[PDB]
Design a protein around this ligand. Structure first.
Ligand SMILES: CCC[S@@](=O)c1c(C(F)(F)F)ccc(C(=O)Nc2nnc(C)o2)c1F
Ligand SMILES: CCC[S@@](=O)c1c(C(F)(F)F)ccc(C(=O)Nc2nnc(C)o2)c1F
Ligand SMILES: [Co+2]
Ligand SMILES: [Co+2]
Lengths: 378, 378
C-alpha cells in the first residue's frame, strides 16, 4: 500500500555531495573509476574563494565533491558578500565533518517543486533545520535539514547545476560513460532505527516501502522514485554487525551506500573491473560457484544460461521479488574507512516507465549467500 | 666547488610522504596519473589502528600517502603499545597539517648511514627536533627534524619499506610504469631564503650547489644526489610572485615541487598526457612554437630535429648548462590549491654514472619563455 502522504511535492534525486579534504583527487579518482564526466566546477578559477567544488555526471547521476580552501582567502567576506557558490557551506563544519567521519556523503539532495516551502513544512513537522532557504541569482532555491548524523537532506528547486558553477571546458571534459544513469537509493546507518524512521517520515510524509546483522525499513516519496532505506544493527550474533562496525569507524550515523542504476550492468561491471587496480574501485569477493549453480532454479525464466554465466564472470548477485528481478553488486569501501560503499544495480520488470524498487533490494541474497557458502564447502 | 662538508653520511632520497585526508583516493589517483605501482600497505588490514599508509613505487621513486583513522580506534593505546607503523605519526599533527595546508608533502626522507647519529649531529648543529630516533623491529631506525614550515626532513637507516608494512597482493598490484625512476630534487618555498639556507645548511653540512619572481639556492649532499632547492619571493613586480601566491594559499612555507627523473621523458609524457583528463595530471600550457623554433639554435647539437619536434608535440622545455642538457615539463597543481606541483625531468651529459644536477634546473627557461612569448605575438 502507498498512502501517497508526501507533505510537499518531491520530484527526483538531484545530486549527492561528498565532503572531502581534497576535492580534486577524489573527483578525479571517482571519474575514472565510475565513468563519470567532469561537468561543472566552482573554485578559484570561477571566483569562489571559499570552497572547491567539482561536479561529475553520468546520465542523471550527479556526484558533487567539495573541500574548503584556507579560511584566510575569504577572511574579509561576510555571508552577504560571500563568494561561495553553495551558501550552506562552512569551513568549520566541513573540516569537522571530514575529520570526524573521513570521506563521505554530506548531502542527499532531492529536487522539489519549492525548496522554501519544502523547508518550512519540514521544519513545521519536526525537521531540525540545517541551512535556511537561500535564493541563488533569482533562479534556484536551496535549503537543508538534518537527515541522520551529520548528513543533510538538501532541497533544490528551479524556476526554470547551480548559479556560480561554470560548465567544464571540453578538453578537460572527457566523455567517459560505463552505463550508469541515476541514483536508485541512498542508505543510512543509524544506532536506532525507530526514532530515525519516525523523525524522517515525520517531516517528509514519506511512506514505508517494504543472520543479517541489521534491521531496516525504506521510506519513499509518492511515486516511490526517492528511496531512503535506513539500517540499525542487531547486537549479539556470531559475526559482529557490519552496521555496528560502520558506526564505530564512521564515528556515528552516516550514509552507508549509494546504489547506482545502470542501463547495462554487464558493461558497467566489465568497465569498472578493468580499472579496479589502475585507480578505480575494487569489488567485494565473488560468491561461490554454488551461488551461480543455484541461479538457474531461481531466475532461469528471467535470464538465459548465457546471461547467468555472464553474471558469474562478473561477480553479479541476483535476487527477485513477486514483481521483478534485480541484478546487484557491491564495491569495497570507497575510501580509507570501512564505511561508505557503492552498489551497482539494474532492475527488470514492473513496466507500466519502470516503477521504483522493482525487485526489491536484494534481501534474499543474505540467505542465498550463506547457503551457497557452506554448500560450496561441500 | 664542492667542499664535501656533510656532517653525516647521506646516501640517497628514500621516499616522499604526503599527508592526506583520505590516503586511498589520493594514492589511487597518483598511481594512475604517474604510473606508479602499489607496493606496500599499513592499515587496518595489517593491524594498524592509527593511520592508513599506502606506498607507490616507480623504479627507486617511493611516494607514501598517509591519513589518520578515527582516534577512537586507538584510544586505549599508548606510544609503548602503539599499532602505528610510523611512530612519528600523530592524529592531531596530521589533521592540523592538512587543514592548514591542504594536500601536500609532510616528509622529505633521505636514507642515511645511521639515523640516530644523523639526528644527534643535526640537533647538536641547530636542527629543531621533530621526532626522536626510534628503532623499528631491531631493523630500521627513523628520526625527524624540521626542514621548513611543517615539512620534516626524515632520516632512515637500515641494518640490512618499513617494519609493519605488508607487500601488496599481486592482484591489487598492477605493474604500471611510464618510465619514472627516482626523485631528482625537492624544492621548498619559504618567506625568507637567508635564514632558511643558514638553518638547513647549518645542521646538515650540505653545500651550495649553484622577472622570475623568486630568489633561490640549492643545498646538496657530498655526492650531490640529494638536491634541496629553496625559494623566496621577490616583491613588487608586475606579475605577482608565484612564490608569494604559494605562501598565501599554502598558509606559509612548504614544499613547492618534486622533480621526478624519467629514463625516457617522451614516453612518460605521452603516457601521462593520454591520462590527463581521465583521472591523471594536467600539464601547464605549452610554450609557443617560437620557443621551439628557437631550440635549434640552442640545443641543435644535442637533439635532432625529430627529437626537437617530439619536444614540441609533448610541450617539453629544454635548458642547458656548460656541463649538460636538461629536458623538463611541469604539471598543474596536484590538488585543490595552487601550491604543490610535479616536474618531469631527464638529464643528458655529465657522464663519469651521471653526476647530479647535470644541466641545472632550467633557470634559463624563464628568460627563454618570456622572449618566445612576445616574439610569438609577432
Ligand atoms: C558487505 C557489502 C554487501 S551487503 O551487506 C548486501 C547484500 C549481500 F551482499 F549480503 F547479499 C544484499 C543486499 C544489500 C543491499 O543493498 N540492501 C539494501 N539496500 N536497500 C535496502 C532497503 O536494503 C547489501 F548491502
Ligand atoms: C609555473 C610552473 C613552471 S615554473 O615556475 C619553472 C620554469 C619555467 F616554467 F618558468 F620555465 C623553469 C624551471 C623551474 C624549476 O624547476 N626551477 C628549479 N628547480 N630547482 C631549482 C634550483 O630551480 C620552474 F619551477
Ligand atoms: Co542497496
Ligand atoms: Co625544478
Amino acid at each position: 500500500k502507498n498512502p501517497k502522504s508526501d507533505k510537499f511535492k518531491v520530484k527526483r534525486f538531484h545530486h549527492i555531495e561528498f565532503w572531502c579534504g581534497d576535492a580534486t583527487n577524489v573527483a578525479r579518482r571517482f571519474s575514472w573509476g565510475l565513468g563519470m564526466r567532469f561537468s561543472a566546477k566552482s573554485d578559484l578559477s570561477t571566483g569562489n574563494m571559499v570552497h572547491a567544488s567539482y561536479l561529475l555526471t553520468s546520465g542523471d547521476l550527479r556526484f558533487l565533491f567539495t573541500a574548503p580552501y584556507s579560511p584566510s582567502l575569504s577572511a574579509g567576506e561576510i555571508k552577504p558578500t560571500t563568494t561561495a557558490s553553495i551558501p550552506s557551506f562552512d569551513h568549520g563544519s566541513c573540516r569537522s565533518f571530514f575529520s570526524s567521519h573521513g570521506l563521505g556523503v554530506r548531502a542527499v539532495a532531492i529536487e522539489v517543486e519549492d525548496a522554501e516551502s519544502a523547508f518550512s513544512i519540514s521544519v513545521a513537522n519536526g525537521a531540525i533545520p540545517s541551512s535556511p532557504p537561500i535564493v541563488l541569482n533569482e533562479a534556484v532555491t536551496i535549503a537543508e535539514v538534518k537527515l541522520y548524523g551529520d548528513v543533510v537532506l538538501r532541497y533544490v528547486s528551479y524556476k526554470a547545476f547551480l548559479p556560480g558553477f561554470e560548465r567544464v571546458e571540453d578538453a578537460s571534459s572527457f566523455p567517459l560513460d560505463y552505463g550508469i544513469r541515476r541514483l536508485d537509493h541512498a542508505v543510512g546507518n543509524v544506532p536506532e532505527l525507530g526514532p530515525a524512521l519516525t523523525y524522517v517520515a515525520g517531516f517528509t510524509g514519506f511512506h514505508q516501502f517494504a543472520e543479517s546483522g541489521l534491521n531496516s525499513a525504506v521510506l519513499a516519496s509518492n511515486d516511490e522514485m526517492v528511496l531512503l532505506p535506513i539500517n540499525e544493527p542487531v547486537h549479539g550474533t556470531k559475526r559482529k554487525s557490519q552496521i555496528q562496525t560502520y558506526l564505530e569507524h564512521n564515528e556515528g550515523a552516516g550514509l552507508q551506500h549509494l546504489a547506482l542504476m545502470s542501463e547495462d550492468i554487464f558493461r558497467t561491471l566489465r568497465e569498472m573491473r578493468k580499472r579496479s587496480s589502475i585507480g578505480g574501485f575494487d569489488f567485494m569477493p565473488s560468491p561461490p560457484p554454488t551461488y551461480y549453480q543455484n541461479l538457474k532454479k531461481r531466475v532461469g525464466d528471467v535470464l538465459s544460461d548465457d546471461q547467468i554465466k555472464e553474471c558469474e564472470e562478473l561477480g553479479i548477485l541476483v535476487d527477485r521479488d513477486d514483481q521483478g528481478t534485480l541484478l546487484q553488486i557491491f564495491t569495497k569501501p570507497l575510501g580509507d574507512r570501512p564505511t561508505i560503499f557503492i552498489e551497482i544495480i539494474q532492475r527488470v520488470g514492473c513496466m507500466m516507465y519502470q516503477s521504483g524498487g522493482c525487485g526489491g533490494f536484494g534481501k534474499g541474497n543474505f540467505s542465498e549467500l550463506f547457503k551457497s557458502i557452506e554448500e560450496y564447502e561441500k
